[PDB]
């Protein structure tokens, strides 16, 4: 039983050139790696290696259009670049943004084959720019292209068109690109669990409340699970894995599963106002460990508090790495969402009923 790792320095070369304090930085990526090497973990992983995703591959979830105004800005004067991302919800470009967008999704696609091939077990992907923001046509909220849906798409080209993947965003924020990208489709099971505050919480839309079920043949296929007024932690993702995720996931039965694996939920995360432990997002892991033969691929997203999100992810690696997990009231207004989510799914999932 072998775990992967995706690690490129390369993908630091994406930074914002008005604003060198903005919180997605460059040494987000180079501190989990850190932390990985101090603990010890990553002799104990094989090392995957990063590469560049091609147009092709972008175009399996992102148009041509967009895809070409992206591969334009590596070119761009500063003026060009501030101008054209200020055309975006939340984003900044420099000329190495491009590449960088490239490496993450290639790095991902990487350790999906190495997964698929039985090369490894399951594995962590330690990249930049995020992703689950980007939509088919535009880019938002820090991410270019999203790396988790063009990976499970990716993962459906090399094996047959309708292999099941579970996609499990446990980043605070709702993936409003994942979820439109897989709205309408049965084959990709999209589940999040975000900050939503009635709508007030970025990305600030009601496309992340529970109500929101998936359309057409992608009925019951999409599952919010959207926090209000409470600093949620342990206990709530506990719950909600319990009552929710796992059942789901177990009806679902997944042959691969991915993790947009933000760690702004995490107690100390600046934007999130969460409090989720390292040993919290530990036991997230070894849950979904137990899911598609323990093929699991656990990607980076947000996360910005240095010193949280390399603690969390060494600890969600040391779980894929098979070591035994660590130790941990409900808050009222959790339950509320869990039963909100548990109606309104309950048509589409006997596990639920
Ligand atoms: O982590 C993210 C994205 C975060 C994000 C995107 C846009 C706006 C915000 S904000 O409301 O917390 N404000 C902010 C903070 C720092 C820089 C830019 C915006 C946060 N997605 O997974
Ligand atoms: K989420
Ligand atoms: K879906
Ligand atoms: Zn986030």
């Given at each position: 039983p072998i775990t992967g790792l995706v690690y490129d320095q390369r993908m630091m070369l994406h930074h914002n050139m008005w604003d060198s304090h903005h919180p997605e930085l460059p040494q987000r990526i180079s501190r989990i790696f850190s932390r990985?090497?101090?603990?010890?973990?990553?002799?104990?992983?094989?090392?995957?290696?990063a590469r560049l995703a091609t147009e092709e591959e972008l175009a399996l979830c992102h148009s041509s259009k967009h895809i070409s105004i992206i591969k334009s800005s590596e070119h761009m004067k500063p003026r060009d670049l501030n101008r054209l991302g200020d055309e975006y919800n939340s984003i900044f470009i420099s000329n190495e943004?491009?590449?960088?967008?490239?490496?993450?999704?290639?790095?991902?696609?990487?350790?999906?084959?190495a997964i698929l091939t039985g090369q490894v077990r399951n594995a962590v992907?330690?990249?930049?720019?995020?992703?689950?923001?980007?939509?088919?046509?535009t880019a938002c909220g820090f991410c270019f292209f999203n790396t988790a849906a063009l990976t499970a798409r990716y993962a459906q080209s090399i094996t047959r068109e309708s292999l099941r993947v579970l996609i499990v965003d446990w980043d605070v924020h709702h993936g409003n690109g994942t979820q439109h990208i897989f709205e309408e489709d049965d084959s990709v099971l999209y589940i999040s669990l975000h900050r939503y505050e009635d709508g007030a919480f970025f990305p600030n839309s009601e496309d992340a409340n529970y109500d929101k079920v998936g359309l057409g043949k992608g009925r019951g296929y999409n599952v919010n699970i959207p926090w209000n007024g409470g600093k949620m932690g342990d206990p709530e993702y506990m719950?909600?894995?319990?009552?929710?995720?796992?059942?789901?996931?177990?009806?679902?039965?997944?042959?691969?599963?991915?993790?947009?694996?933000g760690f702004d939920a995490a107690r100390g995360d600046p934007l999130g106002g969460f409090q989720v432990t390292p040993e919290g997002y530990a036991h997230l892991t070894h849950q979904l460990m137990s899911l598609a033969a323990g093929r699991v691929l656990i990607i980076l997203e947000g996360g910005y508090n240095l010193t949280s999100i390399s603690e969390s992810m060494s600890m969600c690696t040391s779980m894929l790495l098979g070591d035994?997990?660590?130790?941990?009231?409900?808050?009222?207004?959790?339950?509320?969402?869990?039963?909100?989510?548990?109606?309104?799914?309950?048509?589409?999932?006997?596990?639920?009923?």
């Open positions: 990985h090497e101090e603990l010890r973990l990553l002799s104990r992983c094989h090392r995957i290696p943004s491009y590449t960088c967008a490239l490496l993450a999704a290639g790095s991902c696609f990487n350790s999906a084959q992907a330690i990249v930049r720019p995020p992703g689950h923001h980007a939509e088919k046509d719950a909600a894995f319990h009552h929710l995720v796992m059942p789901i996931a177990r009806e679902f039965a997944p042959e691969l599963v991915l993790v947009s694996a035994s997990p660590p130790s941990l009231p409900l808050k009222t207004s959790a339950t509320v969402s869990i039963n909100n989510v548990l109606r309104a799914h309950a048509p589409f999932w006997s596990s639920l009923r």
